[PDB]
Amino acid sequence: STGSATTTPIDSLDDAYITPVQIGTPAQTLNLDFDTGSSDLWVFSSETTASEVDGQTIYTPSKSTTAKLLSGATWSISYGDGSSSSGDVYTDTVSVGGLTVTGQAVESAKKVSSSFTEDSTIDGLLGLAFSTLNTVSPTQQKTFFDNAKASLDSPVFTADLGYHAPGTYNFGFIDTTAYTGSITYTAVSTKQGFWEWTSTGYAVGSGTFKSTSIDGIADTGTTLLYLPATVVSAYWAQVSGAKSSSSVGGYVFPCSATLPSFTFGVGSARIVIPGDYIDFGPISTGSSSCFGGIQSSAGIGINIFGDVALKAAFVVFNGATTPTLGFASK
Numbered sequence: 001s002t003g004s005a006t007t008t009p010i011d012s013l014d015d016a017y018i019t020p021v022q023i024g025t026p027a028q029t030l031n032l033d034f035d036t037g038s039s040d041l042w043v044f045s046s047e048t049t050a051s052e053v054d055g056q057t058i059y060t061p062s063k064s065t066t067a068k069l070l071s072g073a074t075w076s077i078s079y080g081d082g083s084s085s086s087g088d089v090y091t092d093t094v095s096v097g098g099l100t101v102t103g104q105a106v107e108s109a110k111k112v113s114s115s116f117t118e119d120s121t122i123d124g125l126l127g128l129a130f131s132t133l134n135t136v137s138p139t140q141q142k143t144f145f146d147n148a149k150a151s152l153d154s155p156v157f158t159a160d161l162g163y164h165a166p167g168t169y170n171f172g173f174i175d176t177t178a179y180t181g182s183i184t185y186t187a188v189s190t191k192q193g194f195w196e197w198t199s200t201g202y203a204v205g206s207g208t209f210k211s212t213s214i215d216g217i218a219d220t221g222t223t224l225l226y227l228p229a230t231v232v233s234a235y236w237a238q239v240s241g242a243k244s245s246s247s248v249g250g251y252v253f254p255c256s257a258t259l260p261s262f263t264f265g266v267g268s269a270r271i272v273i274p275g276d277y278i279d280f281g282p283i284s285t286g287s288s289s290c291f292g293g294i295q296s297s298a299g300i301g302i303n304i305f306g307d308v309a310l311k312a313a314f315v316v317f318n319g320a321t322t323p324t325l326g327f328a329s330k
């Protein structure tokens with residue numbers, strides 16, 4: 001089997017992407033944030049504290065003839081941005097882009113933190129990291145990918161995120177029309193439960209490539225590119241008037257600037273992030289200070305190749321016995 005679903009930016013900045021997901025019988029379609037940095041499929045629901053729901057579409061298990069309580073199971077998660085959610089668990093039928101899994105753990109939120117409530121466009125998360133990070137207790141549950149894997153034509157999914165445009169998540173096949181040149185594959189460590197890999201270096205604009213190992217994660221659920229402070233300083237030093245602002249919480253730059261590109265290495269191959277992808281717009285409405293899309297990972301404890309990086313590539317998440325990542329230009 002295969003599946004193919006369109007993923008759509010939630011706003012004009014590409015802060016996140018939503019993908020429609022069918023849950024239950026008859027189908028309830030929710031727009032979920034596919035997150036290769038976490039491993040829980042959780043939804044706003046009929047159980048969610050009423051004051052914490054503001055515009056989201058909810059899953060109502062009592063209206064699904066295939067829903068079953070997973071008795072005694074609870075979940076609770078905290079993300080890198082300080083957000084959180086928790087609740088209880090149902091199993092139900094879940095379909096993405098025509099690919100169906102029966103018996104998927106659907107984590108029903110009883111509580112969500114303020115950033116989830118405040119984002120009316122995201123109805124929940126669909127985790128695509130390794131199932132070892134799933135938070136369900138006392139019986140850990142599998143991701144949608146892990147439950148689909150054995151049925152897929154190939155044990156893979158691909159992320160093809162758009163810049164200010166829709167893109168695609170595919171399950172079970174490589175669309176050889178969706179990228180240019182060849183795909184470069186690179187090793188993955190699963191030891192922290194992430195799609196963790198080592199970039200071979202970077203360049204800023206038309207500058208020379210610096211060969212250096214940068215360990216980090218491929219994380220569709222993180223907006224920005226978080227890299228070591230040395231690398232980030234070298235990038236923003238090429239932008240007149242850019243500076244790190246402790247008050248704003250990262251590097252800012254004049255909205256009048258034209259940003260240089262940023263290149264990262266994948267083995268001997270190179271992915272170029274256009275300068276425009278690094279502009280996250282005014283820090284507050286009408287400001288002439290703009291927020292940068294490359295930020296320091298110092299204090300986060302890991303480098304994160306988030307959407308800024310991933311949307312410059314066609315990315316293969318290879319879930320074969322020995323996982324690997326692949327990157328192609330597009």
Ligand code: NA
């Ligand atoms: Na922000």
